[PDB]
Design a protein around this nucleic acid. Structure first.
Ligand SMILES: Nc1ncnc2c1ncn2[C@@H]1O[C@H](COP(=O)(O)OP(=O)(O)OP(=O)(O)O)[C@@H](O)[C@H]1O
Ligand SMILES: [Ca+2]
Ligand SMILES: [Ca+2]
Ligand SMILES: [Ca+2]
Ligand SMILES: [Ca+2]
Length: 901
DNA sequence: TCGGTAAGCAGTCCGCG
DNA sequence: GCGGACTGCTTAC
């Protein structure tokens, strides 16, 4: 095979590399890499190296990396630019792997582990590491085995061995329901003492050294606890054996309010799954416990134990260890579904970076742009210091709050990257400036044509049209990857909807699901075959369709993120190619494009409808427009559509055959006006929305900017079997909103949009009546808890103390002097509940860590003093009042002249 | 929470005769 | 009461 890297480090004057050699085997080598940097030189000189602007450079080959680093200092000490890749291991991979890397994942050791540590005096701090490690479970992806390290003798209790037989039995037999499909993959190793447990673990680790290391909170807990514990018992040299090069750095992570501590293991790439999740999932959750995320992702039951976790190993060692194993499996199931390790490997080997650098868009694009320039013998600039300046963003239209009944939305494809491509925006493509007119003069096509030579943005910047810049060239490659996986996703979704329709009439037989590729639209034959399946086979197909869709969503949405980060990074002072001229050229172009096409759509529709100056575009945000289509439905007449699906088909065909052409002509003209390099403003129909035909539903409504709901029948070509609510910005979309209230508000919206006023009023009444019976956790608010210290005055709230922090302070006083009860952690999330005064907590609210029950000695007093009335008015009624004044409806039935006789 | 802007709403404080 | 200035948070793009 072609060789590929696994991990790379700089250590002193050596690069340390682990790699897969051409025979498929893992190897390590130390290289005395001799780096190269570049200095500008006079035109009259014999060279083949040029900086990105075409000025010649001379290569300076150094005896070692430290020399190169000292040269860089000396060049600043003089006041001259030191060009070229100053991260010497990126330089090493570009030289060592001068081709597109094909990797074989089956040869990369992905390890995912978790540990257990028993602790009578509260949360066991990884830097203290003063309590025994009594369980480790370590899954190895090359062996496909779960290795279980179990301490039977501790100062906190001696125990019997874990039983693999009791572990397999149902929880109803008294077992632990460890899933059948991993039972035969468990290699169980019990130990007499913690010393030997750790020595075997490190001996194991050295035979199977992880390349990728993941888990849940491995970076903030498991890894530092193991390192420090081994350090405390055996000394530092022994702990360092967690690194294959025997070097580790105790690095400090800063933020705006504090400094946590993590351990860097050289020659290993830590991708802690909690962070992979936060970056790539595109969710915001009320809690990031494993229990909680597992339930959300896999619908598996939470792992139940009685007593506190500090007594678990003592009360029920059997379950202790079983739950440790399942925890490890649960991350593997989440990854099987979401596929974030795959994505990370893909992204890492494409950029040619340390795999763990996928969390850094700046680092990823620095390496992509560098290798692209290097292959043309071009030399990247030095990074410079910049003060952080604010700059302008997108345009968002102010909507008239209202119900809106028939809506078609349109949206530009991958806007910021298409603008970059269309305009040719890149550091070295900058041709000059022209004298700007006010933006509206460009929107309304009255301003002077900015150039007849260069390609322009309405911020004043001009750009070369002869050749593509490195930024458009590289952004296009990744755009086309994104576009490919987006097709697999939409096809999987469309096929999803075909399986749902068929579930309405499932055949009575026994059979199995077809072996098909859900990434492609089902053929006529598969559609006939599906019509003859059992409900059980159809449901398995659906699950599979829905797993395929998720897989594509992961791979498409995060390529979208990566290319959109490039546009963003042009406005980050730590990016090598930072330039507000370019950042603002992108955003200002986007503002113009939205309002330009809004004007053209309105002109078009006023011409098709015979009117003058009537607004059809009701809203827009950044790159999208929503268009009222009432006047369009009305011109054929509500009464001539056979059913809902007939007017949707009508609007669809109108959107595709009348409006899309008109939009393209409108954008074609704007490209010509700005004299751009390539027309790439492709605005397709996104959503077609309305109430069910012959219903009293209102279809949709806007309350303000970034706050609306629509009843959608079709979305980017996916025709729903049942209409789908597209709710943006409203409280049903916020993680802060109690789960029970999110659900109730949604149903109220469903009834507004599909069924109308009377139904809304039916539901509201019942919710109000019954809501005192809801679980307290389903009706708590949630919030991030920052700077708890800033507002802590002797245990009482200081000035401007936010509500949720008052709740945390109340909590702290209530659990005073309990080493055992849960503390709220700075930076993490809490549940919040109002208290009726005058209660025994002495304040109007209480908060506790999200994802948990509140400790038992206060749960009764909280449940008893909970202020359900305040709670219903803040979270449910107030938002609902918002929606209904917007939609022109009443949530309570108002008196009329029709009673009482 | 280590790794772009625009803009909503909850809440504090405090004016508004 | 509710608006404005402000902080905190969380969403849409
Ligand atoms: N998460 C983000 N980070 C940075 N910029 C973003 C992000 N989301 C959107 N933008 C900016 O707003 C523009 C419009 O966003 P939108 O959500 O319509 O996606 P898009 O890039 O147009 O891709 P598509 O519409 O094809 O999914 C983007 O091109 C850019
Ligand atoms: Ca655990
Ligand atoms: Ca878009
Ligand atoms: Ca059937
Ligand atoms: Ca959009």
């Amino acid at each position: 095979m072609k060789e590929f890297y696994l991990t790379v480090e700089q250590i002193g004057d050596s690069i340390f590399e682990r790699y897969i050699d051409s025979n498929g085997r893992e190897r390590t080598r130390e290289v005395e890499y001799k780096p190269s940097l570049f200095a500008h030189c006079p035109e009259s000189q014999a060279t083949k190296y040029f900086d990105i602007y075409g000025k010649p450079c001379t290569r300076k080959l150094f005896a070692n990396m430290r020399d190169a680093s000292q040269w860089i200092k000396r060049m600043e000490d003089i006041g001259l630019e030191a060009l070229g890749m100053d991260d010497f291991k990126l330089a090493y991979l570009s030289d060592t792997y001068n081709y597109e890397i094909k990797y074989d994942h089956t040869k990369i050791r992905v390890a995912n582990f978790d540990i257990e540590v028993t602790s009578p005096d509260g949360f066991p701090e990884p830097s203290q590491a003063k309590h025994p490690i009594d369980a480790i479970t370590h899954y190895d992806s090359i062996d496909d085995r779960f290795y279980v390290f179990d301490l039977l003798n501790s100062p906190y209790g001696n125990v019997e061995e874990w039983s693999i037989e009791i572990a397999a039995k149902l929880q109803e037999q008294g077992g632990d329901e460890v899933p059948s499909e991993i039972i035969d993959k468990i290699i169980y190793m019990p130990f007499d003492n913690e010393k030997e447990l750790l020595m075997e673990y490190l001996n194991f680790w050295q035979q199977k050294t992880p390349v990728i290391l993941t888990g849940w909170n491995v970076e903030s807990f498991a890894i530092p606890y193991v390192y420090n514990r081994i350090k405390n018992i055996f000394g530092e040299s022994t702990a360092k054996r967690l690194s294959p090069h025997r070097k580790t750095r105790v690095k400090v992570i800063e933020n705006m309010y504090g400094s946590r501590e993590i351990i860097t293991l050289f020659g290993i790439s830590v991708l802690d799954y909690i962070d992979l999740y936060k970056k790539f999932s595109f969710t915001n959750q009320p809690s990031y416990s494993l229990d909680y995320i597992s339930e959300f992702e896999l619908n598996v039951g939470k792992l139940k134990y009685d007593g506190p976790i500090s007594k678990l190993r003592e009360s029920n060692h059997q379950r202790y260890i079983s739950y440790n194993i399942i925890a490890v499996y649960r991350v593997l199931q989440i990854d099987a579904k979401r596929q974030f390790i795959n994505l990370s490997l893909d992204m890492g080997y494409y950029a040619k970076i340390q795999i763990q650098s996928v969390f850094s868009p700046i680092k990823t694009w620095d390496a992509i742009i560098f290798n692209s320039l290097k292959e043309q013998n071009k030399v990247i600039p030095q990074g410079r210091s910049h003060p952080v300046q604010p700059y302008p963003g997108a345009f968002v239209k102010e909507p008239i709050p209202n119900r809106y009944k028939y809506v078609m939305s349109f949206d530009l494809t991958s806007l910021y990257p298409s603008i970059i491509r269309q305009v040719n925006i890149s550091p070295e493509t900058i041709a000059g400036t022209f004298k700007v007119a006010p933006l509206h003069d460009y929107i309304n096509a009255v301003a002077e044509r900015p150039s007849d030579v260069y390609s322009c943005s309405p911020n004043g910047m001009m750009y070369y049209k002869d050749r593509d810049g490195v930024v458009p060239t590289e952004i296009t490659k990744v755009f086309n990857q994104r576009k490919e996986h987006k097709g697999y996703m939409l096809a999987a979704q469309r096929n999803g909807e075909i399986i749902k329709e068929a579930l309405h009439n499932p055949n009575l037989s026994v059979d199995e699901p077809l072996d098909v590729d859900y990434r492609f639209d089902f053929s006529d034959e598969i559609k006939e075959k599906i019509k003859k399946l059992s409900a059980k086979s159809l449901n398995e197909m659906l699950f599979r369709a829905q797993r395929t869709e998720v897989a594509g969503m992961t791979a498409q949405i995060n390529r979208k993120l990566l290319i959109n980060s490039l546009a963003g990074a042009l406005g980050n002072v730590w990016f090598r190619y930072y330039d507000l001229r370019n950042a603002t050229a992108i955003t200002t172009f986007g503002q113009m494009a939205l309002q330009w096409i809004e004007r053209k759509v309105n002109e078009y529709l006023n011409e098709v409808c015979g009117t003058e100056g009537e607004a059809f575009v009701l809203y827009g945000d950044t790159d999208s427009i929503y268009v009222s289509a009432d006047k369009i439905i009305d011109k054929v007449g509500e009464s001539k559509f056979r059913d809902t699906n007939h007017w949707v088909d009508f609007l669809d065909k109108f959107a595709r055959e009348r409006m899309e052409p008109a939009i393209d002509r409108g954008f074609r003209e704007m490209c010509e006006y700005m004299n751009n390099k390539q027309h790439l403003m492709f605005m397709d129909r996104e959503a077609i929305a309305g109430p069910p035909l012959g219903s009293k539903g209102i279809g949709g409504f806007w309350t303000g900017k970034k706050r609306y709901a629509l009843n959608v029948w079709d979305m980017e070509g996916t025709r729903y079997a049942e209409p789908k609510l597209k709710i943006m910005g409203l409280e049903t979309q916020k993680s802060s909103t109690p789960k029970a209230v999110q659900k109730a508000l949604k149903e109220c919206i469903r009834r507004m949009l599909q069924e109308g006023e009377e139904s809304l009023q039916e539901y509201f009444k019942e919710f109000e009546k019954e809501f005192r019976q809801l679980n307290y956790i389903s009706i708590a608010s949630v919030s991030s808890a920052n700077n708890i210290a800033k507002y802590d005055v002797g245990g009482f709230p200081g000035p401007k103390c936010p509500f949720h922090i008052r709740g945390i302070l109340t909590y702290n006083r209530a659990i005073k002097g309990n080493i055992d009860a849960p503390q709220v952690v700075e930076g993490e999330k809490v549940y919040v509940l109002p208290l009726r005064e005058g209660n025994p907590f002495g304040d109007k609210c209480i908060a506790w860590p999200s994802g948990t029950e509140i400790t038992d000695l206060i749960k009764d007093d909280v449940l008893h003093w909970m202020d359900y009335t305040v709670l219903l008015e803040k979270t449910f009624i107030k938002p609902l009042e918002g929606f209904t004044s917007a939609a022109k409806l009443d949530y309570e039935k108002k008196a009329s002249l029709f009673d009482m006789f």
